[PDB]
Symmetry: D3
Subunit: 246 residues, 6 copies
């Protein structure tokens, strides 16, 4: 039996996130093990989806699915999409199998067995499949009148994995590979999380890396801040989703 | 067995709405049949409510009930109300039996057996019972300070039915009857849907009509756009719902 | 059997709130009785939470828990917190046991056996435990650009109880005790409700008191108005919840 | 303000039901008023459905809809069906618009403006539309082996209304009319509730009537007992719902 | 960053429970700390309720509230009741504030700061307040006919706490105090859990104690087995909850 | 616009299933297309899970995950498991990522791009990974006393796909391949569904095949019957999931 004294606010905050990080590591590694490293099934993104949905403000929705645009083009299948449903309609889909208008998307994340060159490249491919889609923006009626259309922001993209393959972790080889992957704005990976205890992002332009027990809390609060900086999705042009129909 | 090749984004969008249109047609026509054309019970609006709730952005709530104002006046029973709950309180009601402050209302729709003169007139009567109610508007605290009260918008009103009775569909006789019904701003019917495959609206001032497989997707996206143009409900004056109480 | 004629809108509004007031009185008094006036357990705040959650606009969340700040400091256990989750993250908690960032808080209420001097003082102590916590505010990206940080508002605090102990109700002795308790901005009690049928608030600076069947509807609409005047919580500085972590 | 002392268990039980009875009376009478006695819309059964769903054991499901049998025959639209979903499949319907296999049904109730001869006859017609449908019963695999098919029970049927029209309440004229209506096993009305404060049933063969504040609690506990006596629905013959399909 | 290899089934089972044990320890100890050892509020039982609800088979319901019998008698306020809702009605209550018929109860648990003599005695007092209530049992209609009434079983009772106060844990002093408390069948404590890592039960008549990382999984599986041995609650006599009403 | 007359019960039953079959075909084929025939992601089983969960009686639970036994052994990742939660505990998992005791399992289904030899073999491999796991069975307390342990039944296994690859559909080549796959009781595929419009099963020992619009309704009702014949899962031995723990 553990000797328990008292728990203070800082300690409880750390534990509330680190124990969830350990739970995610256990679940995602079970899935990686059972699927033989993603070769006999996809790593099960569901518990990651649940945790990020629980954390994120309710202005954000979180699910897996496919992104579509008003030109009829589709992304690849995306493991985790962070998107708007407060202002943007739902295309008569349901939880676990979304078909999302590109205008609604804030961020996308791919869940892979490990952070390595191969899987960074795959996650960047998924990102590009979303960022290549066309997005509309229209005027906005509000308390102060009608605002001009909001400029689109770059969609945030990342990778979530069980661990980091390089022996030195997220080190020089990692940053060189990330710099090379992110040599195309459609392919940029802004952030990533390994639930064994590492995270990175380029939100401040320079690559910032964290390791250890607080990786999840760092990843989530830093992502919160990046999302904050984006504002709300622009107003979808409803005309363009019906203009080719008879 | 059907020969299935591949499904593209445009095709999936069309099917996702047209198959729901067919499902609604089947359900609403069952209800029309069982009730002997609305004479032994009301056409069951519940599946329509579910579909429009699923489609609409989450800033909108959808339910059946009664609308009330700060003068104690009530509308008739309304089959489908699109309304705000993000800023406007709930009068201790529950799903399926709402008692809604008039300030919260964006739109109302009546579900009837068919689109014909009699049922257009009934749907216009229901609309007028809502539009006659009194609505308040107060100042709005926001990030930029306090905005002056927002001007009210006209509530949108429409009809949903199984089919269209005129042999020529939504044709010259229809537009003349709609023009005559909508000769009173309280009675105007802005839009309508027959799930057999027709829709209309006057959102662009002229009457625009669509028929066939895409009626539902047209109706929903055009309604989305009309709603977009309205902004958010004005801020309710909380004083007027308690000013006659001791 | 009661003779029932008809029900009008004003009458239904009054009943919809007064019958809920009677239900709350019955439940809270059962809890007060079973716990021997709070001495063998806390008065069960759950049904109060349900009613205020049902009434309040969906921009507000309602639950019990603990408030924490970016300095690691905690409030006492709070019976009812009205707070934001639309813009502010959730610290991986669940319903009934929240751990809430101080920036999210609009109001706090303590549930006690009765309104008397002792319990007013306890409710003021709980309020101060929340108001002493540190709150951040950052710039706000929005359709019109980026707004400067929003100034914090004073958190609203109150007391909910079964009845009022003074024989004269909320009278001269009450207002003197409330004036003395509220001689410290951190300890101010802005409002209160006794479900036997009394309420008070200082929203208009002078103390306004109501008694009888409409106490609940007065309390809720007046609180709605006070909340309205506050706007939305300022934007949390995400940096300060991770700045002490390695 | 009301003087509140203490609440004991018996008192809380009575209040928990009588206050809900008053709430239902208020809601159903609002609906009766707004619809002009059922002539401009159906009385809204939704709050009744919610209360009986809340009370009844979870082996029972409660909703509105249509009952269908394996011969393709349908009942009329039914305001409240008490039915099984634990052993009996759902025909891909949703809440508020059920399409229920006759084998699943325990009881049906019709909601009308008042208890009078006309509305008793209508409620009996609805009952007969359900009881005329064909029901199957097959062997039952269980811990002790396989049981022979269970014999069907008579479906329970009743009426729910706002009040009772006869000046003498549920008196001699009522019992004579109920005796005449229930002169056909398909048309029998086993029970009824007027939320103004009356109930009746023939569960003990003789007609038993209650009036006043405890009408709802009597109706619900007596119905519970009648349901108890029926056991679980027999096992549906899955073959008969697909035997006419190619 | 942690080195992660693979996760096997046994390892994942252990982690899935031990990490939840650590989470509960963190939460319950926060609550114990904030409330100053239960003296400024009750330890928050909500997260315990969530975990046991999640684990237990769906034949069991779990909540806090008060137990009542057909004689109008009430228990004290109970932190966690495991009870039936599949066969036994709900007395128009809601989650977090149940008013439960004694016939429905399988088990009760009290949440306290620590396992010590004082808190064992308090948990035994709570148990006795439930076990003293009167329970009915009636015949049971089922596929094989009608069974005679089922004999009542003893309600299971226990204690949940953060840790164990004795320096030697659940040792000789503990077993002597538990033996003395459990010298009255109404006061018997069958089991207990300290989330720091200890559990006990007398399910096999002798006291069996476990310590360490697997305390939660032991407690839950052993409780599952004890519950299994009880069968389903007997059939409530519906007559006795209405026999004193007019 | 379609000419709509009336809808009868048989017609509505057929449409309610066939339109859902068309919806599933559209969704699953979108997923097959976007994933390049399962090579760039798994076919999204989520909408299939939703439909079968909606249809099946509530004694059955439906989800994806991994099956585990009391020996610590795991199945492969399973796309759809039909299992018990009414009597069998949940191993602290959540929807979309279940970790299921083998004793709880009634059936398993694998979702693949098409019915062909390769994918039949893969679905049989998944089945065997579940059927190889160890299952316990203990005595059962019930109204009639204590029953001896229930004998285990063979788990049902199948395949769900978009279409059938053989030009002749489910013909001679299919039945020979199914006969060869099912030459090992652990590998037997009892049933399958192609949402383009074919289904098969061996529930009656001989292979029965259906094609066309009614494939889904046939598959679901025939599966219902097969499940019916199995009874309820045996009672899990709670001891064996904790016997290797210290
Ligand atoms: Ca287009
Ligand atoms: Ca993946
Ligand atoms: Ca007024
Ligand atoms: Ca209607
Ligand atoms: Ca800090
Ligand atoms: Ca309190
Ligand atoms: Ca048939
Ligand atoms: Ca009716
Ligand atoms: Ca009694
Ligand atoms: Ca306690
Ligand atoms: Ca074992
Ligand atoms: Ca698959």
């Amino acid at each position: 039996a553990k000797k328990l004294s008292r728990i203070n606010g800082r300690e409880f905050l750390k534990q509330s996130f680190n124990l969830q990080q350990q739970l995610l590591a256990s679940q995602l590694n079970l899935s990686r093990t059972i699927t033989h490293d993603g070769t006999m099934g996809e790593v099960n993104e569901s518990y990651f989806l649940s945790i990020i949905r629980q954390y994120l403000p309710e202005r954000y929705s979180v699910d897996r699915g496919v992104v579509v645009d008003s030109e009829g083009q589709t992304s690849d299948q995306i493991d985790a999409v962070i998107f708007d449903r407060h202002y943007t309609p739902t295309l008569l889909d349901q939880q676990g199998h979304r078909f999302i208008p590109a205008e609604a998307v804030y961020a996308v994340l791919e869940v892979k067995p490990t952070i390595n060159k191969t899987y960074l490249e795959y996650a960047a491919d998924k990102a590009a499949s979303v960022r290549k889609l066309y997005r509309t923006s229209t005027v906005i009626k509000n308390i102060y009148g009608t605002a001009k259309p909001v400029e689109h922001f770059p969609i945030v993209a990342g990778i979530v994995a069980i661990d980091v393959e390089w022996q030195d972790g997220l080190g020089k080889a990692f940053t060189e590979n990330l710099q090379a992957v992110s040599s195309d704005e459609n392919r940029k990976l802004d952030c990533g999380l390994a639930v064994s205890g590492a995270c990175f992002d380029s939100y401040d332009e320079e690559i910032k890396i964290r390791s250890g027990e607080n990786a999840l809390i760092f990843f989530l609060f830093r992502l919160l801040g990046k999302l904050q900086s984006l504002g709300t999705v622009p107003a979808i042009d409803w005309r363009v989703y019906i203009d080719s129909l008879e």
